[PDB]
mmCIF file of C-alpha atoms and ligand atoms in Angstrom:
data_model
loop_
_atom_site.group_PDB
_atom_site.id
_atom_site.type_symbol
_atom_site.label_atom_id
_atom_site.label_comp_id
_atom_site.label_asym_id
_atom_site.label_seq_id
_atom_site.Cartn_x
_atom_site.Cartn_y
_atom_site.Cartn_z
ATOM 1 C CA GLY A 1 257.887 21.873 -124.566
ATOM 2 C CA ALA A 2 260.401 19.252 -122.575
ATOM 3 C CA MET A 3 258.491 17.391 -119.354
ATOM 4 C CA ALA A 4 260.540 18.970 -117.246
ATOM 5 C CA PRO A 5 262.430 21.661 -118.126
ATOM 6 C CA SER A 6 266.578 21.702 -117.808
ATOM 7 C CA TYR A 7 269.712 23.201 -118.155
ATOM 8 C CA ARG A 8 273.126 21.114 -118.032
ATOM 9 C CA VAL A 9 276.215 21.841 -119.735
ATOM 10 C CA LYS A 10 278.613 19.570 -121.556
ATOM 11 C CA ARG A 11 282.336 20.128 -122.383
ATOM 12 C CA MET A 12 282.399 19.032 -126.133
ATOM 13 C CA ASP A 13 281.913 20.440 -129.491
ATOM 14 C CA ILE A 14 278.513 21.729 -129.755
ATOM 15 C CA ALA A 15 278.322 20.308 -133.722
ATOM 16 C CA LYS A 16 278.181 16.722 -132.194
ATOM 17 C CA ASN A 17 275.218 17.809 -130.136
ATOM 18 C CA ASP A 18 272.253 15.752 -128.853
ATOM 19 C CA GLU A 19 269.707 18.108 -129.435
ATOM 20 C CA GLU A 20 267.089 19.444 -131.561
ATOM 21 C CA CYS A 21 268.419 22.682 -132.407
ATOM 22 C CA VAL A 22 271.186 24.840 -132.202
ATOM 23 C CA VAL A 23 272.619 28.247 -131.621
ATOM 24 C CA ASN A 24 275.724 29.251 -133.768
ATOM 25 C CA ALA A 25 278.033 32.190 -132.378
ATOM 26 C CA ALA A 26 277.898 33.582 -135.575
ATOM 27 C CA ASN A 27 279.164 36.805 -136.917
ATOM 28 C CA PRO A 28 276.645 39.359 -138.865
ATOM 29 C CA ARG A 29 278.324 38.530 -142.396
ATOM 30 C CA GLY A 30 277.423 35.071 -142.272
ATOM 31 C CA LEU A 31 280.880 34.044 -143.214
ATOM 32 C CA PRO A 32 282.295 30.713 -142.055
ATOM 33 C CA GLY A 33 284.554 32.511 -139.114
ATOM 34 C CA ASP A 34 286.249 30.391 -136.517
ATOM 35 C CA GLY A 35 285.848 28.484 -133.149
ATOM 36 C CA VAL A 36 282.325 27.559 -132.585
ATOM 37 C CA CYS A 37 281.411 29.417 -135.811
ATOM 38 C CA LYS A 38 283.796 27.243 -138.364
ATOM 39 C CA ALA A 39 282.682 23.754 -136.611
ATOM 40 C CA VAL A 40 278.695 24.788 -137.430
ATOM 41 C CA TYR A 41 279.946 25.761 -140.932
ATOM 42 C CA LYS A 42 281.817 22.560 -141.648
ATOM 43 C CA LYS A 43 278.713 20.485 -140.035
ATOM 44 C CA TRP A 44 275.741 22.620 -141.285
ATOM 45 C CA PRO A 45 277.247 24.426 -144.300
ATOM 46 C CA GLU A 46 273.598 25.030 -146.143
ATOM 47 C CA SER A 47 272.558 26.781 -142.915
ATOM 48 C CA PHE A 48 274.658 29.927 -144.297
ATOM 49 C CA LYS A 49 272.314 30.571 -147.133
ATOM 50 C CA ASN A 50 271.320 34.256 -146.656
ATOM 51 C CA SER A 51 272.611 33.834 -142.719
ATOM 52 C CA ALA A 52 274.148 37.424 -142.486
ATOM 53 C CA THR A 53 272.159 39.446 -139.315
ATOM 54 C CA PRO A 54 272.733 42.153 -137.352
ATOM 55 C CA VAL A 55 274.767 42.251 -134.030
ATOM 56 C CA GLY A 56 272.150 41.858 -131.653
ATOM 57 C CA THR A 57 270.238 39.977 -133.029
ATOM 58 C CA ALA A 58 269.510 35.959 -134.164
ATOM 59 C CA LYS A 59 268.209 34.405 -137.391
ATOM 60 C CA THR A 60 267.620 30.805 -138.130
ATOM 61 C CA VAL A 61 267.970 29.027 -141.572
ATOM 62 C CA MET A 62 267.046 25.136 -142.147
ATOM 63 C CA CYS A 63 269.870 22.438 -142.744
ATOM 64 C CA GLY A 64 267.428 19.913 -144.447
ATOM 65 C CA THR A 65 264.572 20.112 -141.366
ATOM 66 C CA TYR A 66 267.521 20.973 -138.213
ATOM 67 C CA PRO A 67 267.375 24.168 -137.457
ATOM 68 C CA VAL A 68 270.527 26.363 -137.255
ATOM 69 C CA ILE A 69 269.889 30.066 -135.080
ATOM 70 C CA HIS A 70 272.747 32.427 -136.169
ATOM 71 C CA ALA A 71 272.775 34.632 -132.814
ATOM 72 C CA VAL A 72 275.531 37.704 -133.368
ATOM 73 C CA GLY A 73 276.967 38.706 -130.356
ATOM 74 C CA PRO A 74 278.947 41.980 -129.772
ATOM 75 C CA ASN A 75 282.436 42.533 -130.343
ATOM 76 C CA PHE A 76 283.772 43.912 -127.006
ATOM 77 C CA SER A 77 287.047 45.352 -129.016
ATOM 78 C CA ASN A 78 284.506 47.494 -130.711
ATOM 79 C CA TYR A 79 281.929 48.284 -128.013
ATOM 80 C CA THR A 80 282.101 49.652 -124.975
ATOM 81 C CA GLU A 81 281.215 47.717 -122.091
ATOM 82 C CA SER A 82 277.912 49.584 -121.718
ATOM 83 C CA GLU A 83 276.581 49.310 -125.227
ATOM 84 C CA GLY A 84 278.010 45.548 -125.847
ATOM 85 C CA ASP A 85 276.366 44.300 -122.144
ATOM 86 C CA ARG A 86 272.806 45.971 -124.176
ATOM 87 C CA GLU A 87 273.374 44.097 -127.378
ATOM 88 C CA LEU A 88 274.932 40.634 -125.489
ATOM 89 C CA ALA A 89 271.550 40.836 -124.030
ATOM 90 C CA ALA A 90 269.739 41.175 -126.672
ATOM 91 C CA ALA A 91 270.921 38.928 -129.097
ATOM 92 C CA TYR A 92 270.167 36.327 -126.693
ATOM 93 C CA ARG A 93 266.463 37.341 -126.139
ATOM 94 C CA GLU A 94 266.190 37.117 -129.827
ATOM 95 C CA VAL A 95 267.325 33.337 -129.638
ATOM 96 C CA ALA A 96 264.709 32.482 -126.396
ATOM 97 C CA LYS A 97 262.342 34.061 -129.384
ATOM 98 C CA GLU A 98 263.334 31.707 -132.318
ATOM 99 C CA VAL A 99 263.595 28.609 -130.174
ATOM 100 C CA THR A 100 259.917 29.106 -129.177
ATOM 101 C CA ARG A 101 258.832 29.633 -132.515
ATOM 102 C CA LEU A 102 260.237 26.700 -133.716
ATOM 103 C CA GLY A 103 258.478 24.799 -131.200
ATOM 104 C CA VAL A 104 261.530 22.404 -130.081
ATOM 105 C CA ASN A 105 262.105 20.306 -126.874
ATOM 106 C CA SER A 106 265.705 21.190 -126.958
ATOM 107 C CA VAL A 107 268.615 23.702 -127.681
ATOM 108 C CA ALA A 108 272.503 23.565 -127.859
ATOM 109 C CA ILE A 109 273.710 26.834 -126.790
ATOM 110 C CA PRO A 110 277.131 28.439 -126.364
ATOM 111 C CA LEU A 111 278.257 30.999 -124.194
ATOM 112 C CA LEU A 112 277.884 34.183 -126.832
ATOM 113 C CA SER A 113 280.723 37.206 -126.759
ATOM 114 C CA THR A 114 283.037 34.667 -124.682
ATOM 115 C CA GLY A 115 285.757 33.883 -126.927
ATOM 116 C CA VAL A 116 287.645 36.241 -130.262
ATOM 117 C CA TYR A 117 284.995 38.110 -129.154
ATOM 118 C CA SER A 118 285.440 38.732 -125.286
ATOM 119 C CA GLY A 119 287.760 41.909 -125.989
ATOM 120 C CA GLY A 120 290.264 39.606 -123.558
ATOM 121 C CA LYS A 121 288.108 39.620 -120.813
ATOM 122 C CA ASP A 122 286.522 36.434 -118.971
ATOM 123 C CA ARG A 123 282.721 36.958 -119.351
ATOM 124 C CA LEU A 124 281.828 33.676 -118.041
ATOM 125 C CA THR A 125 279.593 35.100 -115.733
ATOM 126 C CA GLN A 126 277.723 38.427 -117.884
ATOM 127 C CA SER A 127 276.934 35.739 -121.045
ATOM 128 C CA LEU A 128 275.827 33.219 -118.980
ATOM 129 C CA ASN A 129 274.014 35.529 -116.686
ATOM 130 C CA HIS A 130 272.521 37.006 -119.698
ATOM 131 C CA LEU A 131 271.492 33.338 -121.436
ATOM 132 C CA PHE A 132 269.409 32.777 -118.472
ATOM 133 C CA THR A 133 267.285 35.735 -118.253
ATOM 134 C CA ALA A 134 266.415 34.883 -121.751
ATOM 135 C CA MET A 135 265.930 31.499 -121.753
ATOM 136 C CA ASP A 136 263.927 30.962 -117.693
ATOM 137 C CA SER A 137 260.807 31.543 -119.801
ATOM 138 C CA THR A 138 261.067 29.067 -122.030
ATOM 139 C CA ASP A 139 260.184 25.519 -121.626
ATOM 140 C CA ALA A 140 263.061 23.885 -124.170
ATOM 141 C CA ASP A 141 265.700 21.680 -122.621
ATOM 142 C CA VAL A 142 268.863 23.947 -122.676
ATOM 143 C CA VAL A 143 272.400 22.456 -123.022
ATOM 144 C CA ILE A 144 275.344 24.904 -122.770
ATOM 145 C CA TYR A 145 278.715 23.613 -124.676
ATOM 146 C CA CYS A 146 281.823 24.649 -123.778
ATOM 147 C CA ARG A 147 285.202 23.753 -124.257
ATOM 148 C CA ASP A 148 287.367 24.405 -121.296
ATOM 149 C CA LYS A 149 287.619 22.352 -117.959
ATOM 150 C CA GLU A 150 287.537 24.930 -115.377
ATOM 151 C CA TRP A 151 284.735 26.920 -117.283
ATOM 152 C CA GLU A 152 282.269 23.673 -117.317
ATOM 153 C CA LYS A 153 283.049 23.513 -113.220
ATOM 154 C CA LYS A 154 281.724 27.252 -113.155
ATOM 155 C CA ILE A 155 278.880 27.042 -115.154
ATOM 156 C CA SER A 156 277.724 23.815 -113.384
ATOM 157 C CA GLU A 157 278.081 25.237 -110.154
ATOM 158 C CA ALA A 158 275.931 28.553 -111.485
ATOM 159 C CA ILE A 159 273.239 25.987 -112.772
ATOM 160 C CA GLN A 160 273.374 24.114 -109.289
ATOM 161 C CA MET A 161 273.323 27.275 -107.051
ATOM 162 C CA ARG A 162 269.235 27.992 -108.775
ATOM 163 C CA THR A 163 268.518 24.229 -108.171
HETATM 164 C C1 8P7 B 201 281.125 24.588 -128.262
HETATM 165 C C2 8P7 B 201 282.199 24.531 -128.660
HETATM 166 N N1 8P7 B 201 282.145 23.677 -129.743
HETATM 167 C C3 8P7 B 201 283.272 24.259 -130.760
HETATM 168 C C4 8P7 B 201 284.435 23.748 -131.706
HETATM 169 C C5 8P7 B 201 285.515 24.225 -132.482
HETATM 170 C C6 8P7 B 201 286.372 25.166 -131.415
HETATM 171 C C7 8P7 B 201 285.583 25.674 -130.305
HETATM 172 C C8 8P7 B 201 284.330 25.409 -129.765
HETATM 173 N N2 8P7 B 201 283.364 25.344 -128.521
HETATM 174 CL CL1 CL B 202 284.143 16.887 -128.827
HETATM 175 CL CL1 CL B 203 282.982 34.995 -129.483
HETATM 176 CL CL1 CL B 204 284.926 27.221 -122.969
#
C-alpha cells in the first residue's frame, strides 16, 4: 500500500503515466478503439491478448510485468440512464478488486463512460463519484487522467472538498 494513500489529477496522456499500473477505458471486444483505448493500444499492444470482457467488468492482461486493467464502462447510447448507472458503478468495483489483487501501490485511472460512451451528456460528477465509491477502501495512490482544462479544475476541486 501507499504510505498515505491519496487522490491526484493530471491533465495529460494516460499512456505517459508514472504509476505501477493503468486502467484502460476498454470496449467489450478487446479492439484498439479510439481515445484512451487507442493510446493504450499503441503503448501496450501485448496487453490486448484475450482482453475481451463484458460491460461492467475488468480484466487484467500483463504487458511484460506492467499490468493493464481493461475496464468496460457502459455506452449510454445503448443503456437506459438507470441500467448504465448500475454497470458504470460495477466496472469501478471490479477495478478496485484488480488493483487490490495486483498489490500495486499506485494506479492511473481515466473517468469511464465520459467520452464516446457518454451518450452526449457531461458525466464528470457521475463517473468520478462511482470511482470514489470503489477506490476509497483501497490503499493505492490513485492518479486520475483527463484532457480538458475545465475538467482538471472540477476534478481537483472534488478531491480537495473531501480533504
Ligand atoms: C486521459 C486521456 N488519455 C488520452 C489519450 C488519447 C486521447 C484522449 C485521452 N485522455
Ligand atoms: Cl500529454
Ligand atoms: Cl468513454
Ligand atoms: Cl477530459
